[PDB]
Amino acid sequence: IHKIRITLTSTKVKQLENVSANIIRNAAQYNIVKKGPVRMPTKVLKITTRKTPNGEGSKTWDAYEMRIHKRVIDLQAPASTVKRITQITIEPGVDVEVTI
Amino acid sequence: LQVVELATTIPLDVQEAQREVKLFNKWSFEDVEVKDVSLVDYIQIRNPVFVSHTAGKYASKRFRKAQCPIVERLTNSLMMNGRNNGKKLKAVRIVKHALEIIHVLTEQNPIQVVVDAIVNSGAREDSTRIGSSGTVRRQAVDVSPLRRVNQAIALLTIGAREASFRNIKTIAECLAEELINAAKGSSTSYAIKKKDELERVAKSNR
Amino acid sequence: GRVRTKTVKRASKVLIERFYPKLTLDFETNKRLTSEIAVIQSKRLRNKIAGYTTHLMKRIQKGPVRGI
Amino acid sequence: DKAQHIVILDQEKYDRILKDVPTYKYVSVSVLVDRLKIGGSLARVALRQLEEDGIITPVLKHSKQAIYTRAQ
Amino acid sequence: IAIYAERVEERGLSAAVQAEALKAKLLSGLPIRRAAYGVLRFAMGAGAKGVEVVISGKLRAARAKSQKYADGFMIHSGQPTRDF
Amino acid sequence: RKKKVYTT
Amino acid sequence: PVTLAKVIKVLGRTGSRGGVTQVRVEFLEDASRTIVRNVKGPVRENDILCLMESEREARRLR
Amino acid sequence: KSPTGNEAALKNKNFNKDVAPPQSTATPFDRHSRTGKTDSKKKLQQGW
Amino acid sequence: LVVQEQGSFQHILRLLNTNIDGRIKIMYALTKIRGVGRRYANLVCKKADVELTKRAGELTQEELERIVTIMQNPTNYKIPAWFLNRQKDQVDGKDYHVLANNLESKLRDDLERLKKIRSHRGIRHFWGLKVRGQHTKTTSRG
Amino acid sequence: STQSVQTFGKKKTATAVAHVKAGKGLIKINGSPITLVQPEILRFKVYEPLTLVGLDKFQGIDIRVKVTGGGHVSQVYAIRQAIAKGLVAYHQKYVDEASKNELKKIFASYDKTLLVADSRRMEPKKFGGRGARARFQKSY
Amino acid sequence: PGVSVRDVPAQDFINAYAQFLQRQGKLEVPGYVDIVKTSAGNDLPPQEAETWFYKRAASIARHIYLRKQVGVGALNKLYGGAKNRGFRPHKHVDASGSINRKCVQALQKIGVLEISPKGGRRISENGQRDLDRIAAQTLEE
RNA sequence: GCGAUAACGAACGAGACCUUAACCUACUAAAUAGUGCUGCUAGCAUUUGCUGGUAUAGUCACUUCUUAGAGGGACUAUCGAUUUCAAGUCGAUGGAAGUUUGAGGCAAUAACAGGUCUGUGAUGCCCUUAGACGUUCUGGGCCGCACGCGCGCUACACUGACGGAGCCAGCGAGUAUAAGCCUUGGCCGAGAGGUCUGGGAAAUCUUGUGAAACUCCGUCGUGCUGGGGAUAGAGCAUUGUAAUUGUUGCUCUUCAACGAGGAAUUCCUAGUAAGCGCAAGUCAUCAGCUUGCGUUGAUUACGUCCCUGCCCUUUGUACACACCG
């Protein structure tokens, strides 16, 4: 047995929720007790620049955004089982870190 | 009338509020009546309130202001001239103290004096301008009951504000003198000079 | 103002010319019905279309309407 | 610069206060200043004692406003 | 790191390929009208709902001008411009 | 905008 | 000697800036002698607005 | 008074005795080209 | 409570060659003396055991001499050095607190001492301009 | 356990969570009696849900609220809403619904904000001005 | 019923604990209380020169009572106010550190406080005993 | 949009759309959120109660508040008036929400001698190219002061200043062998600040950012006064290689105009205006500035074309580089 934490971060929620559900799915048919996923409060990375490359015109501003969504999943399983779950649910957008 | 024993003890005076809702738990709306048929529907005293602070939505529709309590409309007009905008608790304190001063003076019901000062302060005919693109022209027109009521509150608080400026007399007791004098129709009070001066000019335009 | 546009006015009257027997004078029933009759991309447009179809249905019962 | 309110209490004003303040419908800090020509600070101490001496009944208590009345 | 090169399936539907292809034609001296219509018809031939080509600059004249060469149906405002 | 003139 | 006249019909906005309204008034007592008069403030029907002088009609304002 | 530090303490500020100028604004056909090189129709015809 | 007195009030006081209104409260009456601010006058009154609830004229001569003694000798009455007007004096390096007539004299002596060495700060004092680096383009219009 | 209902009232940002258990007439604000809620001049705003129905309704219930967020005035309005909603929610679950409809009538007939949270929120600020609608002063 | 600190108004509880704590006399008052300003944002020293230190210690004790291990830096933030910057806008500035640190040190050796684990200063075993006592002797009148 | 109709039926733009805010005791879970219970534990009355602390093993329970994903919900819904009985509008009732539900993002057909080659290893041409107009080093300037003007910040006091006490937000940011991030807690120091440890690459720590107005109790008492805090002197620290032409911060002292502002003129219709602060950006240091955020929170319309700009129709034209003709 091993208390293992899996942290999921990505910018887009569709691939994030697929990986999140897929990990939960593999922790269900395998009789592994789980806690999660925990939807962490999303982070809005905001950058407000001036539209004008020069300094002439009405003072108009862009407001760019970069939402970061974070999910943490707690697993009680041996380390070999949890790591192979990660390769099952590998997605280009979502990065995975595994901590005991 | 029975005194209700709670685990959290409740003061005697506030338990008396179960019988009746009174302004600041001191002033009753039951014996208050508007001595003018034309402003009954625009001076709202039928729904009693404890404190003149309701934080309601009276600016959404057109005539919702007529549904705001008359004392709350009065305390709203006190907080003016920049440094007082948004200071409603200060305004409520002034009104609460003003009513007590209006009570020790003339001994009447303080909110009755407030109602009397409002009916006597709204000009019944104001001379609107009909200037044709710059030239000076004035025409005498009638004044709606809503504008008649809310110009009384505007004039009553403006007069109280200026009487307390650079004066040792406090604003609460400048308002009490302003409200008491206008209630009895005395021309000494501000907002009665203004009301007379408005209706005097309107007489010279019809 | 609350003036409905042409994308909702003409699409709603196509429903009446096509599914009058299945329609009714109830918005809630119409709202569910138009979700199985038309492919609406957004819920807000679905409610607007069903809300105007109900108004037209309520008006047909009071007499003949022009254009439908 | 015309106020010149009295801030020191002599004997002529002291008994004048106790003979005149009771015959008032409403007394306060400004009322004492306005009509007795005494200063505001002297008015505040006069009110706090006149209440202790029983001449004056406290209608309402507040720091910024003191509403008082006759006790007779 | 491993790099793989993959061919774009629909050259007519890739504005990057069409812009690079158009640039390789304009730098060869081909006239703008003949060059612009070579991508207008190539985009439609691939099945595009719409296509618009704008070429701006100066061409044998001191004053500069811009010419738009549209085709088909184009949407301009709202979210769908980010999708289609 | 100016003509650099030397002294040394 | 003020007279009270309930309004029964709001005719329309008049005056140069639209700040004055034509209205149709009806007297509280002697429910006749209906007059058209101009009013400054906002007006609904059934306003008991009183008239300092009654013997005067109203027309459009310039 | 060769050094500027020594002379500064001896020069008086005689500024309040002279009056400011009455006006001091010192900062036009944009439509008419001033290049003087008109474009012939042949050049536009060949380019575009 | 209100108390009365006769003949003891002094309408005009004269301290350090400065006329003091006797009906002003003592802490703020002493602020008329140049070089004595509210913060300094508040402390000398507490060091002299003069309760602040007294007007200037209420004070007796015994208290008045006790105050002028403290203001002229602050360090001798456990007044901190950092609280003083003129600390680390230029010539003798001791902590001082200049008063009514001494203040403008030693303020002057600082100006020539700056002007004698012809420092930039001393020069700008001579011209009547702002010396602490303030911009004078648009506000020096007095 | 016992007869417990948990509710909440809201103003602009202030939110007051009320726990209503069966007991004696205990009514606390953050562990402190309601008779000393500040500011004093708005103390009757929280007395309204009490005196409107009569304190006899609170014999069998004890109320402990925890109010956080918002401001001084906004917290008072959150508390009075939590009390009024808490009393109603207890009646709906452990008393006949006839009384709950009775309680809801007096509260609603007096002030809508006693039961319905005010939906007004602060408008976002837009560039080109110091406020939501206000703009920088223009000069010619 | 058991009276607690939370059952008595703060303003008149502090006025009662300050009077008791001064008459008890065991609280050690530093020698600069007649000189110092409470905060750098203040412009004048407290008007109640003889008693201001006692009342502030009473306020500090009550404030620590209702919370858990509040430090002295938080106390500077608590008693700080808006500074009167001349033409620039107002700003929040913390109160003086020594006055608060001396108060908690004075209260810690009088038996009301102690160093709490993981920082701050908890209220003492006897700190509850004597504050809750003053609360009872505050509201009987 | 209704309608009138030599037009009929359409497309772009508007609207739809997307992001955000408001509702959900209805789902899905949460030791990086909260609560009730339960252990253990404290104080006060002893009534079994009331406030706490503790519990990453009490190896509890739950999702109401908190977080976020899947959805639901509003479509002007129902009912009265008016209307060409049409589009609609105005009133009520219900509702979380009935101003396009609030706010934004995106945004047509052409075009401007609008602004930038001082953002670009974006650029054509002209100029310069070794005593350089390249690059770098040192010092100064961009701040310079008889003046006119604009964006703002403090104020002219008592609806206030101080002095104590009460004590409530939201949006965010945060590091490693650096070149040093956010920094609690303890100890010194009147302060500013210094010093020793620890936490945090973060819903975990800074941080409940205990913000300011605000509220209570006192002093002041209409006085250029305890309003206001320029100008200036002396001193103490911080950043930086370097503070002089004061970077900034702190202490004492100095106590200026200003006592509500002419002709004119700006912004604004509801959580809005106005106050009131806070964060992020610039940033070694410096915010009277912007970009946002929240606290307190109104007066007055909810109308018109009277002024002003723009749009449309008719009309005149010797204009079309289009009246700067």
> Which of K32, K34, K44 faces I38 most closely, judged by CB atoms?
K44
Which residues, other chains included, contact B126 with Cβ-Cβ below 8 Å and sequence gap of 6+?
Answer: B140, B141, B143, B198, B202, G40
Q: Please name the residue of chain I whose CA is at the shortest distance from the CA of residue H6.
A: I118
> Which of G16, G49, G52 faces B38 most closely, judged by CB atoms?
G49
Protein contacts on strand L: list nucleotides below 7 Å from a Cβ: 1-3, 10-23, 25, 29-32, 34-37, 42-45, 49-54, 57, 64-70, 72-78, 86-92, 96-111, 113-116, 119-120, 131-133, 143-173, 184-194, 203, 207-208, 210-226, 228-236, 244-255, 259-260, 265-278, 287-307, 321-322, 324-325
Q: Which of I8, I123, I134 is nearest to I64 (CA)?
A: I8
Which residue type occupies D25?
Answer: K
Whether G49 sits inside 8 A of B141 (CB atoms) is no
Query: Are I25 and I55 contacting, i.e. CB atoms less than 8 angstroms apart?
Result: yes
The enclosing H or E element of G7 equals strand G3-14
Alpha carbon distances (Å) from H30 to A60, C13, H35, H40: 27, 56, 12, 21
Rounded to whole angstroms, the Cα distance separating G44 from K128 reads 65
Helix, strand and coil content of chain J, in percent to the nearest 5, comes to 40, 20, 40
- Tally of CA atoms within 13 A in the half-sphere of J90 that contains its CB: 24
Q: Which of G5, G40, G1 is nearest to G24 (CA)?
A: G5
Q: Which of E81, E7, E5, E17 is nearest to E49 (CA)?
A: E81
Chain K residues lying within 8 Å of J43, measured CB to CB:
none
Chain I residues lying within 8 Å of K32, measured CB to CB:
80
The enclosing H or E element of H7 equals helix H4-8
Chains B and I touch (3+ CB pairs under 8 A): no
Give me the DSSP letters along E2-46: -------S-GGG-HHHHHHHHHHHHTTT--HHHHHHHHHHHHHHH
Q: Which of B179, B206, B200, B199 is nearest to B190 (CA)?
A: B179
Query: Are A62 and A51 contacting, i.e. CB atoms less than 8 angstroms apart?
Result: yes
Rounded to whole angstroms, the Cα distance separating B8 from J100 reads 23
Whether J127 sits inside 8 A of A59 (CB atoms) is yes
Give me the DSSP letters along K71-138: -HHHHHHHH-EEE--SSSPPEEE-B-HHHHHHHHHHHHHTTSEEEPTTSSEEEPHHHHHHHHHHHHTT
Vertex A65, ends A63 and A67: CA angle to 5°? Answer: 160
Partner D, chain I 52-111, Cβ-Cβ below 8 Å = 55, 57-58
Q: How far apart are the first and last CA of chain I?
A: 51
Strands G3-14, G20-27: pairing is antiparallel
Strands J61-68, J27-29: pairing is parallel
Q: Mutating which of I123, I124, I140 best tests the H interface, going by the most H Cβ atoms within 10 A?
A: I123
Whether B93 sits inside 8 A of D33 (CB atoms) is no
Chain J residues lying within 8 Å of A58, measured CB to CB:
128
Which residue type occupies K57?
Answer: A
Give me the DSSP letters along J3-27: SEEEEEEESSS-EEEEEEEESSS-E
Whether D26 sits inside 8 A of B104 (CB atoms) is yes
Residue J103's CB is within 10 A of a number of other CB atoms, namely: 21
Q: How far apart are the first and last CA of chain E?
A: 32
Query: Are I20 and I32 contacting, i.e. CB atoms less than 8 angstroms apart?
Result: yes
Chain D residues lying within 8 Å of B104, measured CB to CB:
25-26, 59, 67, 69
Which residues, other chains included, contact I103 with Cβ-Cβ below 8 Å and sequence gap of 6+?
Answer: I34, I35, I85
Chain J residues lying within 8 Å of B17, measured CB to CB:
44, 47, 51
Query: Are K99 and K84 contacting, i.e. CB atoms less than 8 angstroms apart?
Result: no
Residue B156 three-state SS: helix
> Which of B97, B103, B169 faces D30 most closely, judged by CB atoms?
B169
Structure-token pair, residue B196: 């007379």
Q: Which of B54, K54, E3, I57 is nearest to D7 (CA)?
A: I57
Vertex A34, ends A28 and A39: CA angle to 5°? Answer: 110
Residue K62's CB is within 10 A of a number of other CB atoms, namely: 20
Structure-token pair, residue A52: 């004008």
Discontinuities in chain H (C→N > 2.5 Å), after residue: 27
